[PDB]
Design a protein around this ligand. Structure first.
Ligand SMILES: CCCCCCCCCCCCCCCCCC(=O)O[C@@H](COC(=O)CCCCCCCCCCCCCCC)COP(=O)(O)OC[C@H](O)CO
Lengths: 459, 171
């Protein structure tokens, strides 16, 4: 890494000492350039994980996330640079500082070789995000939302810290390699039961799982757009990366204990998508949509079968690029109308023709048509879940049927209808918005040709 | 914890001196300078043996040697001795500065009839090389064995293997 981490860190003094107005220019230049460099890690060898140093290593699961995060960094810059152009230079510089720092932690977290090093930076992502949602938020509930997001993540992470150091004292080193090659049978016992619960709850809260998820509708909606992406597009998957790594030692206790989590995710995903069927805030619509997709990842991890892990990463990457897109979409309207109510701005295809097209493919990707990467992920989990139990196809498909109704629902309510009479401030979409949307959907459809890169560490 | 065996009542019958303090202190210096041979090694026994029971043999000798000194005065200028020690008691401090004239009378008598000279100032307060026959005790405190000290740390320092070894930190 050093070859990505150092350029990422070096963006921090660059943006601070950059020219007065060239901050957005230069930061966008090299963040795209750094993403190009991170494309180098998309290659993985036969079976051994790509190892660079003792503290840093990559595999066929971290690298597809690493490129996603570094590719995201330009996107938050352009999306947020609309409203941020109306404050002090230091304030705008402080934001770009914070996204650069937030991305820096994500790159170092995903390639962490020691589980303790993983946990330190995994929880360290809270500080850049927490200040983003609170300081630069555009509502009043953000103050309560930031507390909800911070406390939920921390309340689960702290048992992990106690559990993690326990492995250090008992088993020895916690390197992701030495853990794998020295896996021992975690026998069923009450102490092992809470050992299992502690090492799992921390990542479950950040998924989020059905019930430990009320921070998401508050955090995501109130957060600024530069944040509203990352809290949905990368760091939810950060909890995912934690699960797929920590479950190396939690066998065979996982199958005996997974039942409450499976039923909560498998049944709650129907309820969560049912919220999306009747919602009032467009941001909340996508937010609860993310919960349903992540809930499908939650069940996917726990069968611990080759197909499930592949469909886990496939949906995990695809949803992040998708859910990031919809937040850009809701941002554009929210700037023009200065409200988030769905029915307020009905009719956009009449006034904005291409915005409807971008909305069409955006709502289509969430609809997960074949061969879109969303479908290639959900379909894999359905087959893996069906092999686990034949009944689950009733629940698994029900969401697939239900997710069609709401995913096309904002398409009908916002785009396909009579334009609202009283609104008169809609402007022709800036070429920044359309260019940003292309930056989201073009890699997604391009990724369809070669799913092997994102298929996970079991291809 | 065991037996506290101590000498019987048989050996505790010495010819105890029947004099009082004034007559004891009236002579004092002459007695100290003429009966030092049984005093020194008995007191040395008291310090070296650290136990009263083991020095009973020397304990009786000093008392016995006192009698030989005491009755030697009786065959001699004991009448000046009586006038002396019967003048010392009258003072509450038993101090010699108020009985100098009788100090002379006792001294002049004992100077020629016996020859016991007056010990000069500081002469009694003197560490002496008393000859003795008993060997020194191997452990006067009867000390038991001593715990073996922990093995000594040694060996040239070597760099800490793989550095700090604390979590993921290296070097
Ligand atoms: C906010 C509430 C909690 C949210 C959910 C958190 C996750 C649920 C589980 C909670 C416990 C997490 C703490 C786990 C510590 C490390 C676990 C581990 O490695 O297993 C040990 C087992 O861990 C424990 O024994 C402790 C965890 C069990 C629960 C009791 C303490 C936690 C609950 C109370 C505090 C947290 C709740 C909030 C209070 C305000 C094994 O050691 P042993 O018991 O075998 O020790 C050797 C020998 O047999 C005797 O020691």
């Amino acid at each position: 890494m050093l070859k990505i981490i150092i350029p990422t860190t070096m963006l921090l003094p660059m943006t601070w000492m950059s020219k007065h107005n060239m901050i957005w220019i230069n930061a966008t230049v090299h963040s795209l350039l750094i993403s190009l460099i991170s494309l180098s890690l998309l290659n993985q060898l036969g079976e051994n994980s790509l190892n660079f140093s003792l503290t840093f290593f990559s595999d066929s699961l971290s690298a597809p996330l690493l490129v996603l995060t570094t590719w995201l960094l330009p996107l938050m810059l352009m999306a947020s640079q609309s409203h941020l152009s109306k404050e002090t230079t230091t304030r705008k510089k402080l934001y770009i500082t914070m996204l650069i720092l937030l991305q820096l932690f994500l790159i170092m977290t995903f390639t962490a070789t020691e589980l303790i090093l993983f946990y330190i930076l995994f929880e360290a992502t809270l500080v850049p995000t927490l200040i983003i949602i609170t300081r630069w938020g555009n509502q009043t509930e953000r103050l309560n939302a930031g507390l909800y997001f911070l406390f939920y993540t921390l309340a689960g992470s702290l048992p992990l810290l106690v559990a993690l150091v326990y492995i250090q004292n008992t088993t020895g080193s916690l390197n992701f390699l030495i853990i794998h090659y020295w896996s021992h049978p975690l026998s069923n016992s009450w102490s092992n039961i809470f050992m299992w619960l502690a090492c799992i709850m921390a990542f479950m809260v950040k998924m989020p799982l059905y019930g430990l998820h009320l921070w998401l509708p508050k955090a995501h909606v109130e957060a600024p757009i530069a944040g509203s992406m990352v809290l949905a597009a990368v760091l939810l998957k950060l909890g995912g990366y934690g699960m797929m790594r920590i479950t190396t030692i939690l066998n065979p206790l996982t199958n005996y204990m997974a039942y409450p989590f499976l039923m909560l995710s498998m049944w709650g995903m129907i309820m969560t998508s049912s919220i999306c069927l009747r919602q009032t805030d467009l941001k909340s619509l996508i937010a609860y949509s993310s919960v349903s997709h992540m809930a499908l990842v939650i069940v996917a991890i726990m069968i611990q079968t080759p197909w499930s892990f592949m469909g886990a990463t496939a949906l995990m990457i695809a949803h992040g690029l998708t859910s990031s897109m919809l937040f850009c979409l809701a941002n554009t309207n929210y700037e023009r109308v200065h409200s988030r109510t769905m029915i307020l701005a009905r009719g956009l295809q009449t006034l904005l023709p291409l915005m409807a097209t971008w909305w069409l493919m955006a709502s289509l990707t969430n609809l997960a048509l074949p061969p879109s990467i969303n479908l290639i992920g959900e379909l894999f989990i359905i087959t893996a879940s069906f092999s686990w139990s034949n009944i689950t196809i009733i629940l698994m498909g029900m969401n697939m049927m239900i997710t069609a109704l709401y995913s096309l629902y904002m398409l009908i309510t916002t785009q396909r209808g009579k334009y609202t009479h009283h609104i008169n401030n809609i402007k022709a979409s800036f070429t920044r918005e359309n260019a940003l949307m292309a930056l989201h959907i073009l890699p997604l459809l391009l990724l369809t040709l070669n799913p092997k890169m994102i298929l996970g560490p079991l291809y | 914890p065991g037996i506290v065996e101590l000498p019987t009542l048989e050996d505790l019958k010495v010819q105890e001196v029947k004099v009082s303090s004034s007559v004891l202190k009236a002579a004092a210096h002459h007695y100290g300078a003429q009966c030092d041979k049984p005093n020194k090694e008995f007191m040395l026994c008291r310090w070296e043996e650290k136990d009263p029971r083991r020095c009973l043999e020397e304990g009786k000798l000093v008392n016995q040697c006192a009698l030989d000194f005491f009755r030697q005065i009786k065959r001699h200028c004991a009448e000046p001795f009586t006038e002396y020690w019967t003048c010392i008691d009258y003072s509450g401090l038993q101090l010699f500065r108020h009985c100098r004239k009788q100090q002379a009378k006792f001294d002049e008598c004992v100077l020629d009839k016996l020859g016991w000279v007056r010990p000069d100032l500081g002469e009694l307060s003197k560490v002496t090389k008393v000859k003795t026959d008993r060997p020194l005790p191997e452990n006067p405190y009867h000390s038991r064995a001593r715990p073996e000290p922990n093995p000594e740390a040694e060996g040239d320092l070597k760099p800490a293997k793989h550095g700090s070894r604390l979590f993921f930190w290296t070097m």
